[PDB]
Design a protein around this ligand. Structure first.
Ligand SMILES: [Mg+2]
Ligand SMILES: [Mg+2]
Ligand SMILES: [Mg+2]
Ligand SMILES: [Mg+2]
Ligand SMILES: [Mg+2]
Ligand SMILES: [Mg+2]
Ligand SMILES: [Mg+2]
Ligand SMILES: [Mg+2]
Ligand SMILES: [Mg+2]
Ligand SMILES: [Mg+2]
Ligand SMILES: [Mg+2]
Ligand SMILES: [Mg+2]
Ligand SMILES: [Mg+2]
Ligand SMILES: [Mg+2]
Ligand SMILES: [Mg+2]
Ligand SMILES: [Mg+2]
Ligand SMILES: [Mg+2]
Ligand SMILES: [Mg+2]
Ligand SMILES: [Mg+2]
Ligand SMILES: [Mg+2]
Ligand SMILES: [Mg+2]
Ligand SMILES: [Mg+2]
Ligand SMILES: [Mg+2]
Ligand SMILES: [Mg+2]
Ligand SMILES: [Mg+2]
Ligand SMILES: [Mg+2]
Ligand SMILES: [Mg+2]
Ligand SMILES: [Mg+2]
Ligand SMILES: [Mg+2]
Ligand SMILES: [Mg+2]
Ligand SMILES: [Mg+2]
Ligand SMILES: [Mg+2]
Ligand SMILES: [Mg+2]
Ligand SMILES: [Mg+2]
Ligand SMILES: [Mg+2]
Ligand SMILES: [Mg+2]
Ligand SMILES: [Mg+2]
Ligand SMILES: [Mg+2]
Ligand SMILES: [Mg+2]
Ligand SMILES: [Mg+2]
Ligand SMILES: [Mg+2]
Ligand SMILES: [Mg+2]
Ligand SMILES: [Mg+2]
Ligand SMILES: [Mg+2]
Ligand SMILES: [Mg+2]
Ligand SMILES: [Mg+2]
Ligand SMILES: [Mg+2]
Ligand SMILES: [Mg+2]
Ligand SMILES: [Mg+2]
Ligand SMILES: [Mg+2]
Ligand SMILES: [Mg+2]
Ligand SMILES: [Mg+2]
Ligand SMILES: [Mg+2]
Ligand SMILES: [Mg+2]
Ligand SMILES: [Mg+2]
Ligand SMILES: [Mg+2]
Ligand SMILES: [Mg+2]
Ligand SMILES: [Mg+2]
Ligand SMILES: [Mg+2]
Ligand SMILES: [Mg+2]
Ligand SMILES: [Mg+2]
Ligand SMILES: [Mg+2]
Ligand SMILES: [Mg+2]
Ligand SMILES: [Mg+2]
Ligand SMILES: [Mg+2]
Ligand SMILES: [Mg+2]
Ligand SMILES: [Mg+2]
Ligand SMILES: [Mg+2]
Ligand SMILES: [Mg+2]
Ligand SMILES: [Mg+2]
Ligand SMILES: [Mg+2]
Ligand SMILES: [Mg+2]
Ligand SMILES: [Mg+2]
Ligand SMILES: [Mg+2]
Ligand SMILES: [Mg+2]
Ligand SMILES: [Mg+2]
Ligand SMILES: [Mg+2]
Ligand SMILES: [Mg+2]
Ligand SMILES: [Mg+2]
Ligand SMILES: [Mg+2]
Ligand SMILES: [Mg+2]
Ligand SMILES: [Mg+2]
Ligand SMILES: [Mg+2]
Ligand SMILES: [Mg+2]
Ligand SMILES: [Mg+2]
Ligand SMILES: [Mg+2]
Ligand SMILES: [Mg+2]
Ligand SMILES: [Mg+2]
Ligand SMILES: [Mg+2]
Ligand SMILES: [Mg+2]
Ligand SMILES: [Mg+2]
Ligand SMILES: [Mg+2]
Ligand SMILES: [Mg+2]
Ligand SMILES: [Mg+2]
Ligand SMILES: [Mg+2]
Ligand SMILES: [Mg+2]
Ligand SMILES: [Mg+2]
Ligand SMILES: [Mg+2]
Ligand SMILES: [Mg+2]
Ligand SMILES: [Mg+2]
Ligand SMILES: [Mg+2]
Ligand SMILES: [Mg+2]
Ligand SMILES: [Mg+2]
Ligand SMILES: [Mg+2]
Ligand SMILES: [Mg+2]
Ligand SMILES: [Mg+2]
Ligand SMILES: [Mg+2]
Ligand SMILES: [Mg+2]
Ligand SMILES: [Mg+2]
Ligand SMILES: [Mg+2]
Ligand SMILES: [Mg+2]
Ligand SMILES: [Mg+2]
Ligand SMILES: [Zn+2]
Lengths: 99, 83, 99, 208
RNA sequence: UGGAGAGUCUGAUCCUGGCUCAGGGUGAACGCUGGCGGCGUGCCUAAGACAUGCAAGUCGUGCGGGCCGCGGGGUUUUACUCCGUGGUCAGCGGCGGACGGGUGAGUAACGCGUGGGUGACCUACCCGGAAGAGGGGGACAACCCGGGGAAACUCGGGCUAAUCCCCCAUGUGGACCCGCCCCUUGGGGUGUGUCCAAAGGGCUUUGCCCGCUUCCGGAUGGGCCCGCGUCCCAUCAGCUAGUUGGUGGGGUAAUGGCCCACCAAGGCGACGACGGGUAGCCGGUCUGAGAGGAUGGCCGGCCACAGGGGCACUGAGACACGGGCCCCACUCCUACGGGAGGCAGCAGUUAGGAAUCUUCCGCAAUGGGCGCAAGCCUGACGGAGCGACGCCGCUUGGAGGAAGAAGCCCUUCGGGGUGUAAACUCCUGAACCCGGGACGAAACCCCCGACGAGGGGACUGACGGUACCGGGGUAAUAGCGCCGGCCAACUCCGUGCCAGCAGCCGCGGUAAUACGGAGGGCGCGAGCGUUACCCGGAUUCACUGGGCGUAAAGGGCGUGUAGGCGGCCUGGGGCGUCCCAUGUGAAAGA
């Protein structure tokens, strides 16, 4: 009895919280950004879409989103922001997106 | 990682190895990529080792890793001899 | 090579989709006579181009949905309902031989 | 282990002289002399016409019992002959004639078949300088079948080679009598053997 | 290069027709018998339940400590404290526990086979190439302190290191929106904008080794998709609601009703839908003249499962045999509150069964995991053990020996048989004794040379003192079946439709070659018979290769649907068909 492969299980729950935390940040910021895009604030939605992107590409640096999984959310975000930003557009910050 | 190693095809007390390219994860006698030579340890025949070096030289370019015993035999057929 | 087939459209009633009937000739493996089997394929028609009775070339494609792994390449021969009427009549015969 | 027991009783059952006894099959004691009828209580009774299988069966035994081999090694030798290229009939004989124990007798090193078997089995026979103690060992053309110098001083060996003086050997064999050497030149042909056995009969025995 | 038949229905005949036998095969079992060795093989039943032991770890060259001990220091002494070192324990962190090993349950299915698609994708470690590593900040174990519980364990407080975690920078480059260019499904390039990098350790410490980061490519491994092939029942004929498609979204490495909302009403079936039964599939194996039939043990490839069911976490990779959570059945501990388990891993036990092995040796070889290395782990593996379970090789003597002993058996009472067989003469020398005594093993490492090529040197056995060689040397296990025909081998006595034989036809009701024993004979021989099962004979499901007037078999007749089939001439096409080239057809087998 008493194999020390339980050491792996103990680490598994460490990484569990880590991955879980970063994801809940990604989601909460993305929904906050797309809220503003739908609500027409062009600067604030952009200032947030940047941090969402930065948080995404940071999550991929580790073992959370490592694959193109990061790219999907980055892709989906910038589209829905730019789309929702088409209601009296005026892309004020213009930082995150391309001309 | 793809490796170069031996595979036992002889019988009980009569071993005959097939120098072989295979993924390290497959069985030592299981499926393999390419047969690159044979080894008779008991040296029962006049020709108990053959390699086809230029083929073995290919797999070392693409990152095959030979065993200590495989590298020992490859050196004996001059895979690494560079003159 | 992507597998390519040539058959006749027997169904218009779906959206963006046509059912293509591809016959096949081959000798029997033991009794040696030439037998004619046939199999229906669900083809993707994005532009709703092809109609009932059209004879089209079908090609193995990246799956569009369940049961839809083929796209319509080109129209070979247009409008021969005799091939369709052959299929309808056989399908119509199954209302008998039940009870 | 092969058949071991009364031999010149099998000279009688086959109806043909079987020289497995070596000598005394030549002297008028073989029991083929003045007793050609088969053994047993009913040996002197008139024999019924043999069935078509009866003839084929007896012909195989007449051949098998001559070399002194169990049916196991016998059958396997046949199935080997049918696959190889050539006439199944003659090839099978040449394979029997390639038996070391049979070559030893054929070379006159031993008086009989059973005797030549024991000479091999005890290591007295040399094949190309090495000892070979297996009677089933198949001799290839060109191999030298000699006598171990350990045994060259044995009185049984100097006995048989004394009567071999001036004696001729088969056209596919040749022997040096003094140095107790010998050589297997070639596979004998059907004509090279005088064996009183119809081979087509034995083949026909195995089609069933 | 290959093809045998026979018995049986009649008083006799021919034909039809079933049954039966000779042959080969087996993971076999049973009876009697049983000498040696080599190579194979060994729970086919309960995927029933399992005692005990072992089967996955490693790294101090990632980091900080606890305990026990030694030595050297700051001090006059003490207290306290600094440094080095040895053992030992876990902890934090990295890589491996997804390989390897087992099983055949479930699956009739893109599960497998085979040939392809991926412009719809992933791939740790390894190899090639380009580039880079600057500064700062933080926490959790160990440990210390307290509490709860019988236990498993668990709760709270405090300190701390790092190759743990985080921020900023540097932007070789990559990611994303949009535009443009070329390709054509999401491929490649380009522009603007935004976002994204990192870690140190080690010494022979000025340089090199083990590592770290981003990107591109290779190699290997894999995911998904497609054509085709894949057992029986029609006494299963109709099936289907995410079911069929669409738009948009969610999710994934990635397509997709994979999931979700909404819209359309579709999708499948006699070319076998749906249901039911059965079953892992193949390479191959057995058989066969072949076509074919049968089978899938061992070995190799794929798949599926890990007591039953469901579920996710961690990760390059799992929905994970020896990881986690939950429900259920069972077994154990229980302070009745609650816990611990999971041999279809190697042996081994029990149950079931006709039946299936040692709780063995070993890290020496090969292979795998970790490490700079030394080395550690490895019931993978290599070996041994047991079992005639299969295959093969080998012995139980060789030669001389009476017109022929004893005994037994038959007899025409003359004699015949066992039979050169034995006795006995001579030679050899299975076992066993004595000595020598392996190959399988050369690298890793060390030294020279630059840790390269190359050269040089050194340690390293389970099997095993076994194999083998040399010497010595004893005549030294034979069994089982059958003898009426097929089918090879016959007489006597015993028994009287009894006792019994029997694969089929049949024997026995007073002379039985068929019962039972003896003598004798035939067949194989360390085996011989038997039962079961598979193919064969069987052309008896007939593609090769059958039939239906009377033998089994024309539908009571018609109409006509589907399907099958198609007169003569020319021409296009080239689907079937034929030919060449090529790729594939793993290895083993044959
Ligand atoms: Mg660990
Ligand atoms: Mg939230
Ligand atoms: Mg993941
Ligand atoms: Mg693999
Ligand atoms: Mg090279
Ligand atoms: Mg040079
Ligand atoms: Mg040079
Ligand atoms: Mg339509
Ligand atoms: Mg769709
Ligand atoms: Mg198209
Ligand atoms: Mg209907
Ligand atoms: Mg043959
Ligand atoms: Mg040929
Ligand atoms: Mg032949
Ligand atoms: Mg000749
Ligand atoms: Mg035959
Ligand atoms: Mg022939
Ligand atoms: Mg021919
Ligand atoms: Mg020819
Ligand atoms: Mg043939
Ligand atoms: Mg009768
Ligand atoms: Mg008759
Ligand atoms: Mg009749
Ligand atoms: Mg009768
Ligand atoms: Mg018949
Ligand atoms: Mg049989
Ligand atoms: Mg064995
Ligand atoms: Mg089982
Ligand atoms: Mg162990
Ligand atoms: Mg230490
Ligand atoms: Mg002191
Ligand atoms: Mg001092
Ligand atoms: Mg003191
Ligand atoms: Mg210290
Ligand atoms: Mg210490
Ligand atoms: Mg440790
Ligand atoms: Mg595990
Ligand atoms: Mg496995
Ligand atoms: Mg096994
Ligand atoms: Mg089913
Ligand atoms: Mg079905
Ligand atoms: Mg397939
Ligand atoms: Mg299929
Ligand atoms: Mg494939
Ligand atoms: Mg701190
Ligand atoms: Mg710090
Ligand atoms: Mg704490
Ligand atoms: Mg704390
Ligand atoms: Mg930055
Ligand atoms: Mg750039
Ligand atoms: Mg730019
Ligand atoms: Mg740092
Ligand atoms: Mg890091
Ligand atoms: Mg590639
Ligand atoms: Mg099917
Ligand atoms: Mg719905
Ligand atoms: Mg969709
Ligand atoms: Mg709509
Ligand atoms: Mg069909
Ligand atoms: Mg099953
Ligand atoms: Mg065959
Ligand atoms: Mg079949
Ligand atoms: Mg099958
Ligand atoms: Mg298997
Ligand atoms: Mg399950
Ligand atoms: Mg179980
Ligand atoms: Mg389960
Ligand atoms: Mg990992
Ligand atoms: Mg699984
Ligand atoms: Mg287990
Ligand atoms: Mg246990
Ligand atoms: Mg029992
Ligand atoms: Mg065993
Ligand atoms: Mg390494
Ligand atoms: Mg261990
Ligand atoms: Mg083994
Ligand atoms: Mg007498
Ligand atoms: Mg004698
Ligand atoms: Mg002696
Ligand atoms: Mg060695
Ligand atoms: Mg050596
Ligand atoms: Mg070592
Ligand atoms: Mg040096
Ligand atoms: Mg060297
Ligand atoms: Mg030793
Ligand atoms: Mg000796
Ligand atoms: Mg004796
Ligand atoms: Mg017979
Ligand atoms: Mg007879
Ligand atoms: Mg009987
Ligand atoms: Mg009487
Ligand atoms: Mg009578
Ligand atoms: Mg009587
Ligand atoms: Mg009798
Ligand atoms: Mg009797
Ligand atoms: Mg008898
Ligand atoms: Mg034998
Ligand atoms: Mg049969
Ligand atoms: Mg047939
Ligand atoms: Mg036939
Ligand atoms: Mg029948
Ligand atoms: Mg026919
Ligand atoms: Mg024909
Ligand atoms: Mg008929
Ligand atoms: Mg009739
Ligand atoms: Mg009529
Ligand atoms: Mg009728
Ligand atoms: Mg015509
Ligand atoms: Mg036609
Ligand atoms: Mg053509
Ligand atoms: Mg092959
Ligand atoms: Mg070969
Ligand atoms: Zn004689």
């Amino acid at each position: 009895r008493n194999l020390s492969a339980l050491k792996r299980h103990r680490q598994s729950l460490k990484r569990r919280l880590r991955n879980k935390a970063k994801k809940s940040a990604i989601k909460t910021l993305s929904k906050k950004a797309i809220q503003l895009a739908q609500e027409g604030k062009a600067e604030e939605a952009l200032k947030i879409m940047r941090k969402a992107e930065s948080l995404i590409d940071k999550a991929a640096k580790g073992s959370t989103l490592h694959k193109n999984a990061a790219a999907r959310r980055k892709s989906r975000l910038m589209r829905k922001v730019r789309q929702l930003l088409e209601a009296a557009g005026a892309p004020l910050i213009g930082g995150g997106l391309s001309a | 990682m793809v490796k170069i190693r031996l595979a036992r095809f002889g019988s009980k007390h009569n071993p005959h190895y097939r120098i072989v390219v295979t993924d390290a994860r497959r069985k030592r006698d299981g499926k393999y990529i390419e047969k690159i030579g044979y080894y008779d340890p008991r040296k029962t025949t006049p020709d108990w080792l053959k390699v086809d070096v230029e083929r073995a030289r290919y797999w070392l370019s693409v990152g095959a890793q030979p065993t200590d015993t495989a590298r020992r035999l490859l050196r004996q057929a001059g895979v690494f001899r560079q003159e | 090579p992507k597998k390519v087939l040539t058959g006749v459209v027997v169904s218009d009633k779906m959206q963006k989709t046509v059912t293509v009937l591809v016959e096949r000739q081959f000798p029997h493996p033991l009794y040696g006579k030439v037998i004619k089997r046939s199999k229906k394929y669900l083809a993707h028609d994005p532009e709703e181009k092809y109609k009932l009775g059209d004879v089209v070339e079908i090609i193995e494609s990246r799956p569009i949905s369940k049961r839809k792994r083929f796209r319509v390449l080109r129209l070979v021969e247009s409008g021969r309902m005799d091939l369709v009427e052959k299929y309808l009549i056989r399908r119509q015969n199954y209302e008998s031989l039940s009870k | 282990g092969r058949y071991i027991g009364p031999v010149c009783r099998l000279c009688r059952r086959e109806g043909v002289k079987l020289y497995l006894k070596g000598e005394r099959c030549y002297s008028p004691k073989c029991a083929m002399e003045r007793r050609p009828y088969p053994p047993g209580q009913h040996g002197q009774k008139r024999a019924r016409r043999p069935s078509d299988y009866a003839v084929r069966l007896r012909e195989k035994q007449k051949l098998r019992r001559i070399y002194g081999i169990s049916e196991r090694q016998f059958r396997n030798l046949f199935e080997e002959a049918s696959k190889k290229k050539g006439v199944t009939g003659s090839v099978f004989l040449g394979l029997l004639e390639s038996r070391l124990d049979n070559v030893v007798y054929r070379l006159g090193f031993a008086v009989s078949r059973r005797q030549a078997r024991q000479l091999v089995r005890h290591g007295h026979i040399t094949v190309n300088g090495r000892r070979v103690d297996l009677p089933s060992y198949r001799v290839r053309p060109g191999d030298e079948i000699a006598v171990a110098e350990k045994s060259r001083n044995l009185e049984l060996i100097r006995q048989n080679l004394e009567a071999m003086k001036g004696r001729k050997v088969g056209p596919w064999l040749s022997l040096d009598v003094e140095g107790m050497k010998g050589k297997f030149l070639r596979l004998p042909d059907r004509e090279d053997l005088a064996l009183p056995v119809n081979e087509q009969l034995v083949i026909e025995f195995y089609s069933r």
